[PDB]
Every structure is written in structure tokens, then in C-alpha cells.
Subunit: 233 residues, 6 copies
């Protein structure tokens, strides 16, 4: 076991969906999986394994923030032998071409974190997903008729930004939304030779000032869930 997962080894399938919200994890396990069992629950961070259309899949929560995500992704890879990690989270739009409930594929993850400078010689690590997972999602979304918005996200240490006047420059550089784990997911997967991709649904628009309740951040995003299950199966 690990200090943050109390599952047995072999309890996780090699493919894992990830959310920050363990209650979103639990909702997916009960609604979309067959024969799902809760396999971990340290610090209330639920994880499950079940079957979707006969194929096995696991779900794990990773909390909020690069440091929290990095903790769970490292243990998933190093102890429980997960090899493919699909984050399906939420994000706050900064592009005007993206609206609430849009699905964003993160083809790179910029950050105001220092974690990647610490990892990578104090230079610029360009944190990116595994291309093949990235193409599976494009194909699967095409096949399901999901309009996937494709671009960079900005992975921040701040949910309440101190740099709102910089959102326009970020959008200009093809950052579609802000979220808080993708750079941590991408850089840890790169460190440990795993395959990762981040999808995110727009729960907030940071320009036009719309938002979603804590409840509809669990249940307004079924298209993203089905997309993730379908491409892992």
C-alpha cells in the first residue's frame, strides 16, 4: 500500500480515469460502471474499479492542485502499475469561443507552478499529453458527435487568480481555460514513462462571469464521462 491509497496491488486496472472530486468519482462508478467496487478511501479520496461494456476500468480522485494530483498520480504509476491516466476535470474558460459545459482537450499545460522548474534543470519543461491518447479522444469524440475544443490550458496554483488582467494574453496564446492539475499530471507521467491526457469541462467562464453550483459540477458533464469511458474501452 501507499500513504494515500489503501488499495491492494492489482486492484487497479492499467487504465484509470481521474477527477479532483471524489464525489464525481463515486457518481461515475455508480452510474456508468457495472460491478464497481470501492477499492481505496484514504482521506475520503475514493477510488473504484468496475467494468464498462465488459472491459475493466478504474476511477481515482486526485484532489485539487498540482501537488495533490502529483501525489496520487505517482502512487498510481509506481505502486499500482497504472499505465494510462485520463483526467476528466473542470476548468474556468478564458477564451470567448468556449462556453459553459464545453469539453476541452489539453494539448499542453502551461503553469505558474515552480514544480516543473524544480524537476527540469530550472528550464522550461513543456508539459504535454501522450499523443496517442490525444488522438483516441479526437477519434472517439468525432464518432460520438462531441465537439472537442482543442488547445492549451493554464495549470495554476491559484483558483482565485491575482493576474486576471493577464487572461487576455493567455487566451491570445491559445490557452482556452485555467485549471489546477494538468501540468502536474503531464509532468509526472513524463517522469515515470506513463501515458496521460487531460479533458476538462467548462464549469466557470472567467471573462463573462458565469459559474456552476457545487452540485452541477458533478452532474452536468455526462458527455465528458462517456467520451472517457468509450475511448478507454
Amino acid at each position: 500500500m501507499t500513504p494515500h491509497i489503501n488499495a491492494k496491488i492489482g486492484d487497479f486496472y492499467p487504465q484509470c480515469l481521474l477527477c479532483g472530486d471524489p464525489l464525481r468519482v463515486s457518481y461515475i462508478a455508480k452510474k456508468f460502471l457495472q460491478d464497481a467496487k470501492e477499492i481505496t478511501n484514504v482521506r475520503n479520496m475514493l477510488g473504484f474499479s468496475g467494468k464498462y461494456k465488459g472491459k475493466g476500468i478504474s476511477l481515482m480522485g486526485h484532489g485539487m492542485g498540482i501537488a495533490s494530483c502529483t501525489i496520487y498520480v505517482t502512487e498510481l504509476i509506481k505502486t499500482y502499475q497504472v499505465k494510462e491516466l485520463l483526467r476528466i476535470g473542470t476548468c474556468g474558460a478564458i477564451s470567448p469561443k468556449v462556453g459553459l459545459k464545453d469539453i476541452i482537450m489539453a494539448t499542453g499545460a502551461s503553469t505558474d507552478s515552480k514544480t516543473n522548474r524544480v524537476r527540469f534543470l530550472n528550464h522550461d519543461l513543456s508539459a504535454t499529453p501522450d499523443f496517442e491518447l490525444s488522438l483516441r479522444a479526437y477519434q472517439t469524440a468525432k464518432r460520438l458527435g462531441i465537439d472537442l475544443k482543442i488547445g492549451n490550458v493554464f495549470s495554476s496554483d491559484f483558483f482565485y487568480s491575482f493576474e486576471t488582467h493577464a487572461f487576455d494574453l493567455m487566451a491570445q496564446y491559445n490557452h482556452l481555460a485555467i485549471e489546477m492539475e494538468a501540468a502536474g499530471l503531464y509532468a509526472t507521467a513524463m517522469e515515470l514513462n506513463a501515458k496521460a491526457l487531460c479533458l476538462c469541462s467548462v464549469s466557470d467562464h472567467l471573462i463573462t462571469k458565469e459559474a456552476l453550483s457545487p452540485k452541477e459540477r458533478i452532474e452536468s458533464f455526462d458527455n465528458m464521462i462517456i467520451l472517457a469511458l468509450e475511448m478507454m474501452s
Copy 2:
């Protein structure tokens, strides 16, 4: 409401104890509080209001890492009007001056995070607790027979450090242990003119590699809990 706390404005007392683990927050409420009320549970992150020896007190989980801690503390101060915040968490010792079960009062929280450079003009913010809160802890500690270890902590973005060979330097400069939220608690409380303190129980030693039994984990925790509740009442 806020996106991460579904309490009603007025449900929190102006004094709040904090843990990273929402189950540890749960342990405190069932074992030590009267009239304990669950007031929030977004993302399984639990918070409570109850009474200790007739005095109102709140409890809130904040998750792992500076980014996550910053979210909850920002919302507790800005929206729920919490004024005093006492973190009681776990840590890994790096100093020969402290051993397993020791309680550490963090008079400074160094960090490898970039969050305070972003906050504080790209300069060095010296993240520190409120002095009257630290004095109150020290007087209550002496009055209970607890021997406080008092020095800096190092709040890291990494649970799995890439710089273990630097722990000696950290301990040279009076860093007693490593945790992952203190700097975030301290900087947020400084930003928003609130009073904060971090207490940490040594649950592992990262140099001697000693750890505690899950049984001993709890009585050490019980000492820190009573100290915390006695300070606040």
C-alpha cells in the same frame, strides 16, 4: 456559497481548526465536540461547527498542498468571516532536534512553491504566523505539560522529494520538519488580515526512517487536538 464550501454564511465560528485529512476533521468532531454539526461537504471535504467546554469552534478540512489549502482558507476568511485559523497537521521530521510524537509550532514556513513570489512582487515573502496565536499556543502547551518544538517548517510542493540530499541544509537553517500547507495558510492569512498558526505532529522521521504505528498515530494526534481546543477556548 462558494464553489468548495456549501455552508450558509454564519455557520462557521470565527475560530477554526484545520486538517488536511477530512477524516481527521471527522475524528475531532465525533470525539471532542458537543452539538457537532456538519456544515459543508463539497468534494468530501468536511467542515463542522460545535462546542468545546461551552465555547463555539469550527473545523475544516483543506486537502494536500499549498494550492488546495489556499482555496479553503481564502473562502473561510473572505466569505465565512473566519478570523483565527489553527492548522494541526502531520509532518516528516528532518532535524535531530525532534523525534516521533513531537509537536512542532511553525514560527516560519519556507517553501519551494512559487506562490509567494507570484503574490509578493517576485521577492522573498517570509511566511509567518500571528504572534499572539503562537504565544497562546506556548502558554497553553506549558500549562498542559506539552513540550513544543519551535522552529521553521519547509512547506513543499513534493511529497516525493527530488532533493533529499538538501534536508541537512534545511535542518541546519532551523527547519524541523517538512509538510505541504503551512506556507499557503500563512501567506493567505497575511493577505487577508487574519490570524493563523500551524502546529505539526511528527508522524515519521525522514532521516532516521522511523515511523509510528497506526495506534500511536492517534494518541499523538490526541495531544495536539486538546492543545488546539484548549488554546481556542
Copy 3:
């Protein structure tokens, strides 16, 4: 009509292949295009407009280094209305996962330059290609039986490096090779909202110390020229 390009507005087609070496640009206009006409030659940096399988293509040299490349693709995009930019260049491999003759698709370009911190708020810009260009590249490579090697490159300010002891860490973090322009191309195309992608041919390999002859230095470069011209056509 710009300081570094003396063509006339309109001389360039909206699609354009790029190399550092302007004699490869010259080589491609003479060997693969019909009606090859040289439109610019400031500072001996040659550009052409031709046709391949009937469709107008342009070519341009961008020089060595992020700063040179940035000057050229800036002026291409802003004044000469270019919209797609496909750099095809040579690199030194550092990863065990690629051998010589291999073609690399850079899904991200890390860097030791400061240019992106200057562009992007002193934060970490994940410099990435346009996704539909890298999709077009994947499909066209599939169709011509080329096995694209897909990962990050490291765009350095240094040809003669001072950190050769770090090439392993780069390759561990999925950096397949080193070159000197991708990060600038990707950032500039992001800034000015044009589509860009960088392909690289494994000229030599800086860990195996292996290389091979100038006659083979041209077969592998021919493969990449065809892939590039096919996907733009």
C-alpha cells in the same frame, strides 16, 4: 517590405515549409517544386514560391536559434499573410527510443531560453504545435508508411552545450532530441494565431555517438521533404 524579407506582399502562399539552412530551402525549390521562383534573399536567407502536385507552396529559411527563427516567422505571418508553417529540420537524438533516419514530430518544445518567460508573464509556457497540423502529419505519415517518432524536443540556446550530463533527464522526460528553433516557432505561431508544427530528422545521436555519411544525410532528409509536401498538399 520587411527588414528581413524583400519579397512583395502576395509573393508567399498561405502555406510554407521552413528550414534553418537556406541552401536546403534552395535545394527543395530546385528538386521538388515546379515553377520555382526565388522571392526573397535579404542576408542570404532565401525564400521561394512554387507548386507541388499543382498547388502553391512557399519555402523560407529562418536561421539558427530561437531569436532568428522568431524574426522570420513573425514577418511571414504578420506582413506576408502566411497561415500554416511546417518546420522540417535536423536534430541530435538523446533518447534510446529513436535511431538515425527517424523522423520526430515535436508535440512540445521545451527550452532553456528566456524568450517564453518574457512572452508569458515570467511563467512556464508549454510551447505546442497546432493539433490539426500534427494530425495531418500523423495521417500522411501513416499513408506513406513512415513510422513517426512522437514526443518532445528540447530547443536550446546552445549548440555547444554546458549541461551534457542532463541529456538523460531530458530523455527520461520524453525529450527525444535537441534542436534550436522549435520553441520559438511554436511560441510565435501561438502569439500570432497561426498553425505550426516542427518535424525533425535524426541526423546524429548524442548518446550513441553514432552518425552516418553525407549521402545518407540526404535520403532521410528526402523522406521528410515528401511527408511535408504531401501533408501540405
Copy 4:
């Protein structure tokens, strides 16, 4: 002897007060100490030993800036075996919580210097004083009826600031005033396992642009001298 102190080993009591101004040091010796004796004068940086209420106290000037303060307290600790160092200096208020003539106790010392990043792995060292001196100062102030103002200082490399528009932000983050040495004193004492504390007399207000007259400066200074002598004896 050292390159900046020409006293004999043993000429310093293990407790030492410090000012930047050596004429302030001399003033303290003449007006408050019995059997006062000059013991060093290299570079006109005067130091003294003497007695207050029959107990031995030393006094030393340390000049202006972190660099100069660091030299003198490194030599006091390593060569002359000073164990407790109490800086009593002047400062410029930036916070509406203090006014002219106030005494500040610096529980933290932020900085725009690079010195702590060179000492401390390019991370953020939170430069803090020894807690028992802090407590001794708190108690002695109460005993004397002094209202001690407690928070951070900003130790700058600049007396004539280039960032006067950031003063409100610094005050927001609980920086009560600016001086030029407390961060060096704190970091050097942490490096060398000594006890240090910084007190400051507000002799200027950098926001209102008012300063204490010469005579008021001397009165404010006398209160701090008495507090310092009372707590060291």
C-alpha cells in the same frame, strides 16, 4: 581577531545589542552602561562591553545593508562566541497599523535581496527570529508598559526604493515597515545556530512622508534601548 573586528576573544559578552549606526552604539555605552569600554573600531565600526544593572552586555555596530550586517554577525558568532544578538534599529513605516515613534518586533523579515536564495537552494527561506527572544521581548515590553507592534519587516537592498507603488501591497501582507538588515541578521543566525531578534523604531513614515524630529528620534530610541537592556538582563 577577524578582518572587521579587532577585539580579543572574550571581549564580547555572549549577549550583544546591534545598531547599524556605530555612534548610536557609542551613545548607548556612554549614557546607559557602567564600566563601558570600547573593544573594537575597525573601519570606525565601534563596539563596546559594559554592565547594565550589574550584568554584562556587549554592543556592536553592523553598518547598512544585509551584506554588511551579515559580515559583522558572522564574525560575532563564529569568532567571538556571541549567542544572543538583539538588533535595535530604525525603519520606515508603510502600514497604517503603526505610527511615528512606535517600536516594531519583526517576527519575520521578507527581502528583495538574493542572499537567502543563494544560501537556501534557490527556494524561499522564511527568515525568522528566535522565539524565546521574541517572548522575552514581549514580556519585557508588557512589564515596561510599551505597546509593541508585532509583524513582518521588509529588509530591502534599497534605501531609495524603486517600488514605492508596492508599499500598500507590502503593508497588506503584514509588513509594518522597511529597514535594511533584519533578513541578513535572521538568516545568518539560522545558518549558525544562534538566537537573534530585531526591534525597530519607526522614525519615518514612508506613506505620510513625515519624520521624527532629531529630539523625538532620540526619545523613541531611548525607549527601545531600555526595553532591550531590560530584556537582556
Copy 5:
């Protein structure tokens, strides 16, 4: 013998003139040297060797940007044993002490590049020319009747700047103009124990927006070519 120069070892005289533009290199060989042969032309970057007033002089293009310049200057020194490198280029004035046609000698080259921090311990390398070279330049200019404008230059990674509001700050700090190589030339010559100096002809004034007509630029370059050839002979 080097990947970027295809001359035999010995084609270069130990003194070399450099320009960014290899067609400026050519023009100097054809109009000013006797017995001028071409010695290198990889990537269309022309070098020559010839005679001026009976004495040997070489010419070498270095391309645009510090990374390009560092490649050529590194190979000139290390392989072709060049010992003195005189760079003569164009630049955009920012200071009111200089006008168009003025010739500038860079007694320092500031920079927004990271190359010198990578080279020099992540500190500030103050990149400067060889003093004896700068003394020849000065005495020769006096003999020829040229009024040299002497001060710092700012070597940028950007022809198209993102900090035009800061040109006034640069000019206040004795930066006479902006160009893109001197800092790389100076740093590389310092690393490898060679003598380097940069002269620059004011083509534009980025403040007054004034520019030179062609011819007028050709005649300003000529004054600098002769200064450069006289001081090497």
C-alpha cells in the same frame, strides 16, 4: 572542419571582422580588400580572407541572435584559432545622446537572454569587450576624425520587442541602442580567452522613429568598415 564552417584550418587570419549579414561580409571583401578569396559558405553564411594595406584580415558572418552568434564565434576561436573578433553591425538607437549615422562602441552588452545565467552560476555576468581592443577603436577613431559614441548596448532575443515602454529606462542607464549579438559575442570571448569588441552603426532611432535612406546607410556603414579595417591594420 566544424558543422557550420567549411574552411580549412588556417584560412582565417587571427583577426576577424564580423557582421550579422553575410552580404555585408561580401561587400567588404569586394569593395575594400585586396586578394580577397571566399573561404566558407555553409548555410550561405559567407566568410572571406584578404588584405588591407598589406596586412591580413578575415571576415565572417554570424547571423542574427545570440545563439547564432555563439555558434560561429565558438568555432572561430576553438577551431580556426581566431584571437581578435571585431563585430560591426547595425542597431536601433534609444538614447538621445546619439543620432543616425553615429557609430557606437559597446563597453557593455546587457541582455534579456538567459545564456549568461546558464553560463555564469545563475548570477549576473557583466558582459564586456577586451579593453585594449576598445582602446585601439578609440585612438583610431580620433585619428580618422570619427566621434565615437561610447556606452552600453542592449542585446535582445527580440527584434520585435514586447517591452517598448522600457526603452526609456534602458537609455537612462546608458544603453545607447539595441541589437541582438554583442552579449553573446562578449560572453563567448570571455569564456574562451579571446579579445572581442562590438561597434554599431545607428540605422534607426526607435524613439524619434527616424530612419536612414539607403545610400545614407551604405555611407554610414563605410565609415565603420574603415574604422574597423584601420584599427586592425
Copy 6:
């Protein structure tokens, strides 16, 4: 007047010599000047005006460290209208190109301080002296028969260094010696459009560990004082 200088305006001649140590300022005034008057003495930092070869010259101490130097030369320039500032200090040699007794002329001053980054856009300020002063120093040393060692120095925030491993790299990049103020003198004079130069006497060699006796220290210093006075008249 100013907070660190109590002379009256007009008490300083426009030319002024500087040492870190005010007692050396005093020695110069008493041994080398006629009609010497002490004009300032705040904080025991002595300054003088007097005659040499019938011409007026001033002298001022500036303390140890960039921060302290910056204070004094800002006030000398802005309030007392000093226009030429010639620092004559002592230094620790690190290069094999120089031995004891040597006099170094600093054509640039590198640093580990953040002061210039804070002054200069967080880029690399190359801190340099006024060329005409350095030309005067060269010609006067020629006439006086002094052999000038000419190159960079490294201005450090540290007398007791944490980076002795790196002295050889510094010496490779033409840093002949280490001292603690040249970078601040140069940067402030640039800021405020004054003429500055630093000369340093080699009194210790930090590599060969050799040092001058006290007697030889004053003979070397007297050489440099005569050079300074002669070039200032």
C-alpha cells in the same frame, strides 16, 4: 542635507574618491591633501574636501556591500552634485593573471546581488564604468609606471562565500578579483548619469592563499591613491 551625509551643499567638489573604510578616507585626507576639512560624519562615515596639486578634490566613505555603497553615491550625486566618482578599494584575487600588490581596473562588475535585476526589468544589466575615466586611469598609470591589470570583478553580497567551488569559473570569464561594491557604484552612476570607475589593490589571493603584510598593504594602497589623485587633477 541628507540622512547619511551632514555636509552643506557646496562642501563637495565635483570629483570624489571613495573607499569602503572611512578610516582610509581619513588617512588619505591627512597624508595626501592640503587644507583638508572633514565635511561629513553621520554614522562615523567620514568625508573630506581638500587640495591636491592646487585643485579641489573630495573624499567619502561608502561602507561595505552594494546596498551601503548605493546609499552614499546616490546622495553624493543627487544632493551634493558630485559628477566623477572614483572608488579605490581592496579585493581578493581569484585569477592567475594577477598577484599581490597588483592594481586592478574594473571594466565590468558582475554580481550575485539582485539589485540590478530589480533596477533593470529583471534582465541582465552589464554594470560598467565610464570609458573616459577608465582611459584617464590607463594613461595616468602609463605615465606613473604602474602596470594595470584590466578586467572584470565580481561584486558579491558575501565576504564569507558559499560558492568557493566557482572561483575558477569566475576567473575563466575574466573576473580578476572579488570585492563587494563595484556593481552598485556602476549601476547607481548609470542610473543617475554620473561618471564612475573602480580601482582595487590586490591584498590577498583567495586561490594561492597568499597575503600582504600590513606594511605592504599600505605601500600598495599608496600607489593606488597616487594614481587616483593624479588622474583626478
